[PDB]
Amino acid sequence: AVAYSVNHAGVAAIVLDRPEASNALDRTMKTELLQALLAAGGDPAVRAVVMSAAGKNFCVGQDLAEHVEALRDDPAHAMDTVREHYNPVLEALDAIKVPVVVAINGACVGAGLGLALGADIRIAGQRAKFGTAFTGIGLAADSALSASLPRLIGASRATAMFLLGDTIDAPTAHTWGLVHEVVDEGSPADVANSVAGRLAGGPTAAFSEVKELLRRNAVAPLGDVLEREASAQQRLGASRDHSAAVEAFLAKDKPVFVGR
Amino acid sequence: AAVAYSVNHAGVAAIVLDRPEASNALDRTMKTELLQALLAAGGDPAVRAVVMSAAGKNFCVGQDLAEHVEALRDDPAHAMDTVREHYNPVLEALDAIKVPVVVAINGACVGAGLGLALGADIRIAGQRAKFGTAFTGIGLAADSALSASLPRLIGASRATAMFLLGDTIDAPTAHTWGLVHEVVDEGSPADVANSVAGRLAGGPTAAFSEVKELLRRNAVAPLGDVLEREASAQQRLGASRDHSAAVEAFLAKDKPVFVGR
Amino acid sequence: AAVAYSVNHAGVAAIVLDRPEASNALDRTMKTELLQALLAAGGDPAVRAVVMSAAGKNFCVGQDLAEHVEALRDDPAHAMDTVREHYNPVLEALDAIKVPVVVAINGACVGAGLGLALGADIRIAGQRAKFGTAFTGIGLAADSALSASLPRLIGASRATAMFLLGDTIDAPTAHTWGLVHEVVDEGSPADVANSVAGRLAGGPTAAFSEVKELLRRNAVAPLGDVLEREASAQQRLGASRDHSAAVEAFLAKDKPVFVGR
């Protein structure tokens, strides 16, 4: 239901594989997704992660039928899944230190959007549609979407998407900063795999450091920004990948990077 | 009188700046009445959405000139007491409104007028709207939360340019920059703002209040806090009447009817 | 000699990178002299604006390669000492300047050169200016505050692509993204920057300093703190000479002269 593999080049592939339900997230999906993300995060050989999905739609979020059962069974506790399933998935995704690429086809809504916005690089097919969804069904937000959406497109457009509840299309998402590239529908997994392959061959420690600097320094005082930068640069200055790159540059030559 | 207040049958509170002869310049009367209207809208359980608009050609030119001149001649050291006394409670009252706030912006929107407009959630601009900080043009800095609201909407760089260079920007620029959500024909901002408020007033009001609070609280929060707050908000709403109604509507592939609880 | 410093008649401090033969690559001499120029500018009470520019075709290609190679071969474990010893004080010194800072960007602006440029308030680029982070290209991450300043200017998505994929952008992309305020003909950026700096220098310098500090303090502050700080700053400016001058001049349909207090 969620496929996981790590190839020779150290690219971990996580594929949502429930296309008949538009990759709607039932307990089986949520459990296997968590496992896939934790494995990617805990494997020292993984130098990049690519997240993709089978069928026409990336992820429509929570499985409706499973939600109906919980709601009819115990309405005061029907959102237990947020703590039990969604939160650890988002934390597992966040814990991944290497670059994460996502290939977004068709519908990407609710927790599906939440999952996608947790990646570092986002590639959309031309017919991709992005939506908060939660307020449409009288809910607010989960899957970190109340933070990740405004941080990518700003508070004003995030607020509009949540209150008006309308889907936006791929070009609008590109213009707004929600995704990095728009490609032909059916091509985003191929492009994401190439981008992930390219990242996996790069200086993995440098990528992990800069990713962490970016997260920590978003709103920090300048003094803290500069101190953390200095320390990260000192660690990388001593890395094998840094000497290899400098030596390659002097030799008018292309470096091979190994991630340390 | 100077600020008109009413609440319709749909639960839309309408707030109208009604001093068009002075381009809705904020004197003591305007400020005191604006506060009362905002507090009334914020405290009324029946209000499901708020719409802010302005009579005449211009939305709001900010602080009343004559009145400020009197204060400045009378006592230069205390000429800006009104910021604490009037503008700050106004911005807190607007911020305290839990439900969606929509504003129709026509013509000049500058100074405290701009601060007021940027406190709204959805901003609808007329073709001939003009936005400007105005403060440094007369040797002041900023009030009406504009030193936070502007950079949060258009980014630090463009906000810094508006404040330092005193650049006024037009409607399509404001749109592209993210200062307003839509640009329509001049004269229409009110009508479009009213439709939008009406639409939002018919939506899941408890969910709208929750998500607005989540967006505000989670802007720079650690992930663990973001996720905990989201879990709690969803659990509160999972027990709402609107959520059950929406679930059974979705099962039939209908759009739900919402009552706001 | 490596960095030129002067303060003109109008209180404009000019800082010019003047190692054109090396595309203004920052070696120890250059870094030390840049720090002294920024400290002089920040501590001089006659200074009312700052303009940063560079001789030759390229603004600044960042760290000097030859000096870096020598440190790396001598002692790899400490090869980045310079970040703490040189770059960090430079960025703090730039940040400590209270008055407006304008930068003119010709040609290549990469690495620490980009960091330096993004610490300015107003950025004017020539048509052939190019911007890149460069660090990960050689297995480093970030310095010169770029892990903060870049995403704060262009957003998290674009900054992440620049850092991770090594995407280099040209002037019109930079303009659309909000990385620079203006693109002019190559070989006009310093001219335009000087005009802008000159206009800012003749402006209400105390007001400019207050609003810049308000913008920085209030970026992520709670509304109560935002409003309190705005009121205090407005009260201080309300009693300034420049503010009275502005108001008297507007009443007499006349241009005001500002002295910065």
Domain ranges, ordered by start, for chain B: 1-203, 204-261
Distance from CA of A214 to the nearest CA of B (A): 13
CB-nearest to B164 from C122, C242, C251 is: C122
Beta pairing class for A100-104 and A48-53:
parallel
State the architecture of B204-261 in CATH terms. Orthogonal Bundle (1.10)
Resolution (A): 2.3
Strand, coil or helix: C52: strand
- For A158, the closest chain B residue by CA position comes to B215
* Nearest chain C Cα distance for residue B260, angstroms: 27
Min Cα–Cα distance to chain C from B200, Å:
25
**What is the number of alpha carbons within 13 Å of residue C251 lying toward its C-beta?**
11
CA C208 to CA C92: how far, in whole Å?
19
Query: Using CA atoms, how far apart are residues C103 and C14, in angstroms rounded to an integer?
Result: 10
Q: What are phi and psi of C3, to 5 degrees?
A: -125, 125
Tokens of B27: 């004197």
The token pair at B186 is 């001049």
Q: Are strands B3-7 and B12-17 parallel, antiparallel or unpaired?
A: antiparallel
Report the neighbours of C using a cutoff of 3 or more CB pairs below 8 angstroms.
A, B
Residue A49: strand, helix, or coil: strand
- Of the partner residues B123, B230, B251, the one whose CB lies closest to the CB of residue A146: B230
Question: Residue with structure tokens 């440029």?
Answer: C117
- Among candidates C251, C53, C230, A250, which has minimal Cα distance to B82? C230
What are the beta bridge partners of residue A102? A51, A122
CATH ID of A203-260, from 3.30.420.40, 1.10.12.10, 3.40.50.10320, 3.40.50.920 = 1.10.12.10
Q: Among C65, C118, C152, C164, pick the best mutation site for testing chain A contact (most A Cβ within 10 A).
A: C164
Interface contacts (A, B; CB < 8 Å) = 148
Contact A14, A51 (CB under 8 A): yes
Please name every residue paired with B103 in a beta bridge, in sequence order, or none if there are none: B52, B123
Q: A224 and A213 in contact (C-beta within 8 Å)?
A: no
Beta bridge partners of C170: C130
Q: Which residues in chain B precede a discontinuity of more than 2.5 Å between C and N?
A: none
| CB spacing of C238 vs B72 below 8 angstroms | yes
Q: Which residue has the tokens 């993004």?
A: C118
Interatomic CA distance for residues C136 and A187, integer angstroms: 27
Residues B13/B47, Cβ–Cβ less than 8 Å: yes
DSSP C129: -
CB atoms within 10 A of CB C95: 17
CATH fold for the domain made of A1-202: 2-enoyl-CoA Hydratase; Chain A, domain 1 (3.90.226)
Chain C residues in contact with A151 by the CB 8 A cut-off are 156
Instruction: Provide, as residue numbers in chain A, all residues whose Cβ is less than 8 Å from the Cβ of C80.
Output: 230, 233-234, 236-237
Cα gap C84→C37, rounded to integer Å: 18
Nearest CA-CA distance, residue A116 and chain C, Å: 13
Residue among A75, A135, A140 minimizing CB distance to B239: A75
- Report the alpha-carbon distance of residue C123 to residue C184 in Å, rounded: 11
- Among the partner-chain residues B178, B218, B229, the one whose CB lies closest to the CB of A156 is B178
Q: Please, are residues C103 and C193 in contact by the beta-carbon 8 Å criterion? A: yes
| Contact across the interface for B100 and A163, Cβ inside 8 Å | yes
Please say whether the beta carbons of C86 and C28 come within 8 A: yes
Sheet containing C130-132: order of strands: C108-110, C130-132, C169-170
Residues of chain B with a CB closer than 8 angstroms to some CB in chain C: 68-69, 72, 76-81, 83-84, 87-88, 91-92, 95, 135-148, 151-152, 155-161, 163-165, 219-220
Are residues B72 and C247, on separate chains, in Cβ contact within 8 Å?
yes
Given an 8 Å threshold on Cβ–Cβ distance, is B95 in contact with C223? Answer: yes
How many B/C residue pairs have CB atoms within 8 Å? Answer: 141
Instruction: Please spell the DSSP secondary structure of B93-104, one letter per residue.
Output: HHHH--S-EEEE
Distance (Å) from the alpha carbon of A137 to chain B's nearest alpha carbon: 5
Burial of residue A13 (CB within 10 Å: 0-12, 13-18, 19+) is: buried
For chain A, first and last CA: distance in Å?
Answer: 34
CB < 8 Å to B142, chain C: 211, 214, 230, 233-234
Q: Are A118 and A144 within 8 A, CB to CB?
A: yes
Angle of helix A145-153 relative to helix B223-238, nearest 10 degrees, comes to 120
Give the chain B residue nearest C123 (alpha carbons). B157
Taking a C-beta distance cutoff of 8 angstroms, is the pair A70, A80 a contact?
Answer: yes
Q: Taking CA atoms, what residue in C is nearest to B84? A: C231
| Elucidation technique | X-ray
Would the CB atoms of C122 and B151 count as touching at under 8 Å? Answer: no
Inter-chain CB proximity C243 and B140 less than 8 Å: yes
| Alpha-carbon torsion (A52, A55, A57, A61), positive or negative | negative
Q: How far apart are CA C239 and CA C219, in angstroms?
A: 26
Beta strands C130-132 and B182-184, pairing class: unpaired
Alpha carbon separation from A158 to A18, B31, B158, B159, C187 (Å, rounded): 29, 30, 19, 19, 40
Residue from B86, B94, B157, B212 whose CB has the most chain C CBs within 10 Å, to mutate? B157
Contact C238 B140 (CB under 8 A): yes
In chain C, the residue whose alpha carbon lies closest to the alpha carbon of A48 is: C164
Residue A10 main-chain phi, psi, to 5 deg: 85, 20
- C144 CA: distance to closest CA in chain A (Å): 7
Interface of C with A (CB under 8 A): 68-69, 72, 76-81, 83-84, 87-88, 91-92, 95, 135-148, 151-152, 155-161, 163-165, 219-220
Say which residues have a Cβ less than 8 Å from residue B136's Cβ, sequence separation at least 6: B163, B164, B166, C203, C204, C207, C208, C211
CA distance A107 to chain B (A): 17
Strands annotated E in chain B: 3-7, 12-17, 49-54, 101-105, 108-110, 122-126, 130-132, 169-170, 182-184
Same fold, B1-203 and B204-261: no
Query: From the CB of residue B9, how many other CB atoms can be counted at a distance below 10 Å?
Result: 6
The dihedral built from the CA positions of residue C133, A224, C25 and C20, taken in this order, carries a sign that is positive
User: Cβ–Cβ of B81/C178 closer than 8 Å?
Assistant: no
**Nearest CA among A79, A171, A73, A54 for reference residue A134:** A79
Of A196, A214, A217, A194, which Cα lies nearest the Cα of A206? Answer: A214
Residues 6+ apart with CB under 8 A from B168: B110, B130, B131, B132
Radius of gyration, CA atoms only, chain B:
19
Which chains are within 8 Å of B by 3+ CB pairs? A, C
Tokens of C211: 């609003």
Residue C72 distance to chain A (closest CA, Å): 8
Of B84, C141, C50, C125, residue with least CA distance to A208: C141
Closest partner CB to A157 (pick from B178, B210, B256): B178
Q: Which residue of A has its CA nearest to C89?
A: A226
**Please, which residues have CB within 8 angstroms of residue C130's CB and are 6 or more apart in sequence?**
C107, C108, C109, C110, C168, C169, C170, C171
Distances (CA, A) of A1 to A15, A19, A28: 8, 9, 7
Q: Which of C248, A59, C245, A113 is nearest to C261 (CA)?
A: C245
d(CA C257, CA C202): 8
CATH 3.30.1660.40 fits B1-203, yes or no: no
User: How close, in Å, is residue A124 to chain C by CA atoms?
Assistant: 14
